Write a protein that binds this ligand. Structure first.
Ligand SMILES: [Mg+2]
Ligand SMILES: [Mg+2]
Lengths: 113, 48, 225, 49, 226
């Protein structure tokens, strides 16, 4: 659940606007987790298409099947805009609830691995 | 005595994979095929 | 939103049935099918052989003169006997079998009993050789689940042999979810339940009992404390 | 699977989801029908469970 | 030999979390009951959500407004946190108007009051305006169930309106646990604990009652063959 999926359908392809990248994903030109560049920043469709306000919303989308635990999306957690997968966010909640301390558990884990 | 399979009994195949029964599940809890046939034994792929 | 789904029933005799519930919202194919499948496979009442008495036989680890099969094999054959009680109030019956060799005694050789029907008369029980005799008193009880002989330990006589009882009349349950569509929305579920039974209880009856069990369990979430 | 077709049953919604993950793991060929992808999994000894 | 009817105990704190225990249960019925309720709780409980937002002088979602710390995405994220309860059953869709001038910390209470519309979290932060910043919003709130991404509904009231993911579900999280329990000589019994998190528009008890009623209604569909 903590490993992130990597795609190669439209890897290395560049667009001009974030809407253009989303349109290409609709036609199947680029995959959800394929590394792309919008203007000059390396991103993916999942980071732009799926921006979740909280871990509960991100996991609700997983429960409804929109995204998998391994898809890289944008989640707002701890007051920070994280480009992570729901599974990595889910792992953070496992540690946070086990120790009953959200801030200390944030300092205990390596989220991006 | 007629001994049935119980938890703690040792099972093995011919390839050296051996283990004791740790859990006996009811039929509705076992993984099943789309046609409804449940499996009989669940083996850990980490033993291979 | 969506109106009442149409319920379609297809039955193949008394042992197989298909039950289609469409259209359904997304996810209610699993939401309905799996709970019914778990209840169908576990908690459907039926009948099973619980004890067997054979004349001149003291335990199940013996052989009978003139009989090819030992008592263990006879009990194994009796565990596959399917008995249908036509009377809902009937809880216990005893089937009498008196056979003399040479014959292949089947389930149809039991003496007739009122409100009792053998669903597999061709079930092979024992092979009698010339000079061999088989006088059995097979007790069939009504119950739920799987009760090993070591638990119930039912013996109507001194030398009666308790038999592991598999009361479930349901052999196999599968449910299928198709991509159905209605109007302009196409994420709807078409649920099809496939039920195989032993014939004593029909798949339609088993489905109704499973629904009632789930409905009764849903009333347990009342009276909060 | 051919017995399923005769009985009047197509491909399960649940099987379609598993096939969708299966092509992301490189286990089935993208672009094939669900029946063909299920056969590809079967030739590897794997079924949708 | 049938088991005695179980006892339904509730442990509800506040209006957003509650634990519900049902015991004793037959073997396997904790899973038999827990999973259907969780699927219904996360997808079928009626609720309200923001489905469209219009902000003056904003063209796309990935832009920013001169005069506010939060960009369009962050405000959209804050709007997805908004919990609103319709007081009229016939009411289906409302639009909430927000006109604030900087320097202000815009909250959910700054929305103009609408008849039979109640903001359940009026302390929710929306945007932080600096001096000279003008903020004009028209947010569209619909009625629905579950989770609908913005692209899969694409609701726009006017030009330049930004569709937003609709968190219709009032239930935020469901976690059910099945524990082995005993009653005398029976040891395979099940103890089911259902824990429900809700946004506060409905009680976790009310969400459970609605989920049970939905499952009960679907069970009546197995009637009138063909
Ligand atoms: Mg989006
Ligand atoms: Mg039987």
């Amino acid at each position: 659940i903590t490993q992130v999926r990597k795609e190669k359908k439209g890897a290395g392809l560049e667009f001009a606007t974030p809407e253009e990248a989303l349109a290409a994903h609709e036609r199947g030109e680029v995959a959800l987790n394929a590394p792309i560049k919008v203007a000059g920043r390396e991103t993916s469709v999942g980071r732009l298409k799926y921006v979740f306000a909280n871990p509960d919303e991100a996991l609700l989308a997983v429960a409804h099947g929109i995204v998998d635990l391994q898809d890289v999306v944008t989640v707002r957690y701890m007051g920070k805009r994280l480009e992570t997968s729901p599974g990595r966010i889910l792992f953070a909640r496992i540690v946070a609830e086990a120790v009953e301390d959200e801030k200390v558990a944030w300092e205990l884990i390596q989220l991006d691995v | 005595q007629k001994r049935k399979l119980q938890v703690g009994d040792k099972l093995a195949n011919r390839h050296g994979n051996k283990g004791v029964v740790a859990k006996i599940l009811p039929v509705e809890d076992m993984p099943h095929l789309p046609d409804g046939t449940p499996v009989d034994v669940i083996l850990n792929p980490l033993g291979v | 939103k969506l109106k009442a789904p149409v319920f379609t029933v297809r039955t193949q005799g008394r042992e197989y049935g298909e039950f289609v519930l469409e259209p359904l919202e997304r996810g209610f194919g699993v939401t309905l099918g799996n709970p019914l499948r778990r209840i169908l496979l576990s908690s459907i009442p039926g009948t099973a052989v619980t004890s067997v008495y054979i004349e001149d036989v003291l335990h199940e680890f013996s052989t009978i003169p003139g009989v090819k099969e030992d008592v263990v094999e006879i009990i194994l054959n009796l565990k596959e006997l399917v008995v249908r009680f036509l009377n809902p109030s009937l809880q216990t019956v005893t089937l009498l079998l008196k056979a003399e060799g040479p014959k292949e005694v089947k389930a149809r050789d039991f003496l007739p009993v009122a409100d009792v029907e053998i669903m597999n008369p061709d079930l092979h029980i024992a092979t009698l050789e010339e000079g061999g005799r088989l006088n059995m008193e097979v007790r069939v009880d009504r119950g739920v689940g799987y009760v090993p002989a070591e638990k119930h330990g039912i013996k109507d006589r001194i030398n009666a042999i308790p038999v592991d009882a598999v009361f479930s009349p349901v052999r196999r349950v599968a449910f299928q979810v198709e991509d159905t569509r209605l109007g302009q929305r196409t994420d709807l579920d078409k649920l099809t339940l496939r039920i195989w039974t032993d014939g004593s209880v029909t798949p339609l009856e088993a489905l109704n009992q499973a629904v009632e069990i789930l409905r009764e369990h849903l009333t347990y979430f009342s009276n909060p404390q | 699977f051919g017995k399923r077709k005769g009985e009047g049953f197509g491909v399960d919604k649940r099987e379609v989801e598993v096939l969708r993950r299966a092509e992301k793991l490189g286990l089935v060929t993208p672009g094939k029908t669900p029946e063909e992808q299920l056969k590809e999994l079967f030739l590897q000894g794997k079924v949708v469970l």
